[PDB]
Amino acid sequence: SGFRKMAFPSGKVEGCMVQVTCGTTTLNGLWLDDVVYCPRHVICTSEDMLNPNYEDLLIRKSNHNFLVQAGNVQLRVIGHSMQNCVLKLKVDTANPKTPKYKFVRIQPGQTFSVLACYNGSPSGVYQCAMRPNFTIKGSFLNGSCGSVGFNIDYDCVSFCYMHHMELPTGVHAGTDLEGNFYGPFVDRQTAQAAGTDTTITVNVLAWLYAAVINGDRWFLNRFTTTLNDFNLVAMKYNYEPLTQDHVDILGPLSAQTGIAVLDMCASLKELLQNGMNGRTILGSALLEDEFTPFDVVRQCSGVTFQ
Amino acid sequence: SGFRKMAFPSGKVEGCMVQVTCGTTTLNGLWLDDVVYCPRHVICTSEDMLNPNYEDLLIRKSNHNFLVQAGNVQLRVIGHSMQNCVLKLKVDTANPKTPKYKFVRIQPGQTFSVLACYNGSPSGVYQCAMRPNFTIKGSFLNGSCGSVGFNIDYDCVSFCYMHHMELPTGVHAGTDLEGNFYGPFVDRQTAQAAGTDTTITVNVLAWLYAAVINGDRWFLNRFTTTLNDFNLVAMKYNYEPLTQDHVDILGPLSAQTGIAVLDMCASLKELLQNGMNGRTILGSALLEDEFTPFDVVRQCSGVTFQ
Ligand SMILES: O=C(c1cc(=O)[nH]c(=O)[nH]1)N1CCC(c2ccc(Cl)c(Cl)c2)CC1
Ligand SMILES: O=C(c1cc(=O)[nH]c(=O)[nH]1)N1CCC(c2ccc(Cl)c(Cl)c2)CC1
C-alpha cells in the first residue's frame, strides 16, 4: 500500500538525450535513429527573440553551425530541416540506444513523466499533468529547453512533450514532437498569458478511490447524486464537468472498492461545499487532480514494463 | 522556476535489477559485478515466516535452489552466503552494466529515490525521506521486496536502502545494503510497530526558502527569534529541535534570498501557532518536510549528473 507521485523509469529516455549548440545558444535535443529533434528557437539570438522570422534565420545557417554532442562523442550534422516549431538535424550516426517509440499528442487531464535535462545531461524525473489550459506546472531552470515528456506502454516510449518556454506566471509551455504547440502559444519572447485553469474532476475522483483503497474513508456518505446535479455544483467551483465517458473510465475503481461513481460524486459535492475541516486525504489537505484513473490502477494494483 | 517532487534519473539502476526465485517465492535482486543482493527472507516458506531460523534454512539450500533471471538470460548461481539480513548470491557472469557505486547508510531526515520493481522489472520511481522513526512512507505492492533506494552523486550511485516489508500502519521498513535494518525491526512476520514520528524541521525551513525563491512570500514577517525560543515551540508541535549545524546547512539558501535563518524560524513559529488560514505554499496546504536543503539547492539553482 501507500500512494506517491510516481514517474516512469527514465532509462530508455536518458540514452536519447544530447546537447545541441548553435552559436552561443545551447540546449537539449532528442536523438532517435539518425535524427536529433530540438526546439527551433536554438537558432535565435538576442536580436531575434522578440519577432523571429525562422525561415530567414534557418536559410542563413549551414550544417556546420550546429554542434551536437552525445556525452563526449561529437555527432556530425549532415542535414537540417524545420517541421513546425521543431528543428530536425540529420546526423551521420544512428543512435544504437534508440528504443521502440512513437510520437503521440496527449489531451488535457492526461499525465506524463518529464526528464529534466541540462547540457544534454539528465538531472531529474517527475510526473505532471497537462492542464486544461494547455500548460504544465513543471520545474525548469535556464538551459532546460528540449527536455521531453513521455509515457511508457509495455516496451514502447510514447513521447508527448518537448519543453520550449516558461510563461510569466511560472508555468510551462511546449509542443508535441511534431512541433505543434499545446495551447495558443508561439515561440517568441512576447508576453503571453495562459487561459484560466480548471480542476480535472475525473482525476479528483480517481484520487478519492485511491484514498479508499488505502484506508482513508472519512469523507464517504450514503447519499447519491445524478450527473446533472453534480455538474451544477462542479461548475460553481471551477471544476471540469463530468461525462458518461468519465464514469465508464472509473469503472474498475468502482468495481474494486464497491462504491458507485455517483456515490463518490456525492462525497466530492460535500467536500467542495464544506471543505475538509483540517482533515487530510492521502497526506494532502487539498483535492489532488494530477492522477488519472489509469495512474491509480497502475499504482494500486501493479503493472510493470519491458 | 517551479518546484516538484523530483527523483533521480533511474537508468543506471534499472540495468542492475534482476528477478530471484527460491521455491515458490520470487522477488527482486540487485546485480552488481558478480554478486546478486536480495532480502534473505526469499528462503522462507509459509511455515517459517513467523519465527524463521535463517541459519537452519540456508544450510538446507544449495546453489541450484536459486533461480536468477536478468530479463531472459539465466544467471548461474555458483555460491551463496548471508550477510546480516541480505543474501549474497555469487553468479558466473559479472554485470556489464555495473555503474560506479557505493553502499552508504543514510540518517533520518535524508531523502533518496526509490525504484519500485516487480519480477525484476522496474515499474516506477519516486522520492521519499527516511523518517525520524526509521520508516519510509513508500508505495509498494506484493512482489516489491528487494527494490532499492539510491542517490546519485556525479557519476556514482549511492545505494542506501533495500525494501523488506510493510508494517501494519502501511509504512515500510528495510535495510542498508550491508543488511542492517533501519530502526528496531526484524525480518519476521510478527506484528511490529514503529515509534512515534516527528516532523523534520530543517527540511520544513528549506521548503519555505524554496517558496520564497518561487515567489510565495505571504508568510514572512520582520520578527526574529533565538534557537532556544524556537525549539521550545517546536517541541510542543512534535517538531525535531533545530541545531546550529542545521542553521549552517541552510546558509546558501539564506544567502540567496537575503532572509536570515532565525528570521525564517520566526515565520515558522507563526505558522505553527495560527495555521495557514486556507492559504497555500508551493501548492500545498500543509508544511512539507521531505525536501532537504540540498534537494532545494539542486532544484532551485541546478546541478546535473554524469
Ligand atoms: O532555458 C530557458 C528557461 C526555460 C524555463 O522553463 N525556465 C527558465 O527559467 N528558463 N530559457 C528561457 C526561454 C528562452 C527562449 C529564447 C527564445 C525564444 Cl523564441 C523562446 Cl520562446 C524562449 C530560452 C532559455
Ligand atoms: O511483497 C510483499 C509486500 C511488500 C510491501 O511493502 N507491501 C505489500 O503489500 N507486500 N510481501 C509482504 C512481506 C512478505 C514477507 C515474507 C517473509 C518475511 Cl520474514 C517478511 Cl519480513 C516479509 C513478502 C511479500
UniProtKB/Swiss-Prot annotation, chains A, B:
Domain Peptidase C30: 1-306
Catalyzed reactions per annotation: TSAVLQ-|-SGFRK-NH2 and SGVTFQ-|-GKFKK the two peptides corresponding to the two self-cleavage sites of the SARS 3C-like proteinase are the two most reactive peptide substrates. The enzyme exhibits a strong preference for substrates containing Gln at P1 position and Leu at P2 position
Segment forming the signal sequence: none
Highest taxon in the source lineage: Viruses
Active site: 41, 145
Subcellular location: Host cytoplasm; Host Golgi apparatus; Host nucleus
Regulation: Inhibited by pyridone-containing alpha-ketoamides compounds 13a and 13b. In turn, alpha-ketoamide 13b (tert-butyl (1-((S)-1-(((S)-4-(benzylamino)-3,4-dioxo-1-((S)-2-oxopyrrolidin-3-yl)butan-2-yl)amino)-3-cyclopropyl-1-oxopropan-2-yl)-2-oxo-1,2-dihydropyridin-3-yl)carbamate) inhibits SARS-CoV-2 replication in human lung cells. Inhibited ex vivo by michael acceptor inhibitor N3. Inhibited ex vivo by compound 11a and 11b.
Numbered residues of crosslink Glycyl lysine isopeptide (Lys-Gly) (interchain with G-Cter in ubiquitin): 5, 90
Cytoplasmic side: 1-306
Outcome recorded upon mutating residue 189 to A: Does not affect ability to cleave and inactivate human TRMT1
Known outcome of mutating residue 49 to A: Does not affect ability to cleave and inactivate human TRMT1
Quaternary state and interactors: 3CL-PRO exists as monomer and homodimer. Only the homodimer shows catalytic activity. Interacts with host FBXO22; this interaction promotes the proteasomal degradation of nsp5.
Cited function: Cleaves the C-terminus of replicase polyprotein at 11 sites. Recognizes substrates containing the core sequence [ILMVF]-Q-|-[SGACN]. Cleaves and inactivates human TRMT1, preventing tRNA guanine(26)-dimethylation of tRNAs. May cleave human NLRP1 in lung epithelial cells, thereby activating the NLRP1 inflammasome pathway. May cleave human GSDMD, triggering alternative GSDME-mediated epithelial cell death upon activation of the NLRP1 inflammasome, which may enhance the release interleukins 1B, 6, 16 and 18. Also able to bind an ADP-ribose-1''-phosphate (ADRP).
Name used for this protein in its record: 3C-like proteinase nsp5
Gene: rep
Span covered, complete protein: 3264 to 3569 of 7096
